[PDB]
Amino acid sequence: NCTFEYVSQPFLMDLFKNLREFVFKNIDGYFKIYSKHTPIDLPQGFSALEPLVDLPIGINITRFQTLLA
Amino acid sequence: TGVLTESNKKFLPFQQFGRDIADTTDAVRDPQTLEILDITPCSFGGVSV
Amino acid sequence: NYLYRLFRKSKLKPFERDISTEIYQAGNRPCNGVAGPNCYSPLQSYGFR
């Protein structure tokens, strides 16, 4: 019943604390995801997040919860 | 309209365009083979008599 | 066969789709799934002749 079935590499390519950063937003029925995998409390400096990931769902989001396993 | 030259610009893998200060196209990525080409207008100038 | 929506709690964002058919509440009296005098069905059929 799934609609989007992208095949990706593992997001933890780094094997240092490998701080992952993500940005999710909803604009006019189009989901946008940003990502960065800089290695390093939150540190100083700048690290721009690349739009290379894109997994759209496009219905409505007002609540969310992190899945854990 | 212009002349195409091989570019040493370090494009990110998600970037296929390049803009100028006046927001005209400066560099373009070829869609067939993944290479970066500069765009420069052809030679011009003023003529005085 | 064709339906359309009449009542909604707010407006719609661009390119948004609504599938859930809940009973509309137009006043201070709760509906709780009962189509009462102040509770209306959100979908009315097109009449085509």
Chain A residues whose beta carbon lies within 8 Å of the beta carbon of residue C16:
29, 59-60
Which of these, C36, C37, C3, lies nearest to C21 by C-alpha position? C3
Chain A residues whose beta carbon lies within 8 Å of the beta carbon of residue C14:
28-29
Measuring CA to CA, how many Å separate A8 from each of A5, A26, A37, A55, B13?
10, 22, 15, 11, 16
- Sequence-distant (6+) residues with CB within 8 A of B38 are B4, B5, B6, B7, B9, B26, B27
Rounded distance, CA B14 to CA B36, Å? 13
Do the Cβ atoms of B27 and B37 come closer than 8 Å? yes
Mutate to test the interface with C, among A3, A32, A59 (most CBs of C within 10 A): A59
Do the Cβ atoms of B16 and B28 come closer than 8 Å? yes
Do the Cβ atoms of A50 and A36 come closer than 8 Å? yes
Q: Please say whether the dihedral angle defined by the alpha carbons of residues C3, C9, C15 and C21, taken in this order, is positive or negative.
A: negative
CB atoms within 10 A of CB B27: 20
Q: A56 touching B, CB under 8 A?
A: no
User: C interface toward A at CB cutoff 8 Å?
Assistant: 13-17
Helix (H, G, I), strand (E, B) or coil at C39: strand
In units of Å, what resolution does this entry have? 3.2
Rounded distance, CA C41 to CA A60, Å? 23
Rounded distance, CA C41 to CA C19, Å? 14
Phi then psi for residue B26, to 5 deg, are -100, -40
Q: Do chains B and C touch, with touching meaning 3 or more CB–CB pairs less than 8 Å apart?
A: no
Rounded distance, CA B3 to CA B37, Å? 10
Name the residue of chain A whose CA is nearest to B14's CA. Answer: A52
- Sequence-distant (6+) residues with CB within 8 A of C21 are C41, C42, C43
User: A interface toward C at CB cutoff 8 Å?
Assistant: 28-30, 58-60
Longest dimension (CA), chain B: 50
Do the Cβ atoms of A29 and C15 come closer than 8 Å? yes
Helix (H, G, I), strand (E, B) or coil at B18: strand
Rounded distance, CA B30 to CA B16, Å? 8
Token pair in block for residue A5? 């079935």
SS3 percent helix, strand, coil of chain C, rounded to 5, is 0, 20, 80
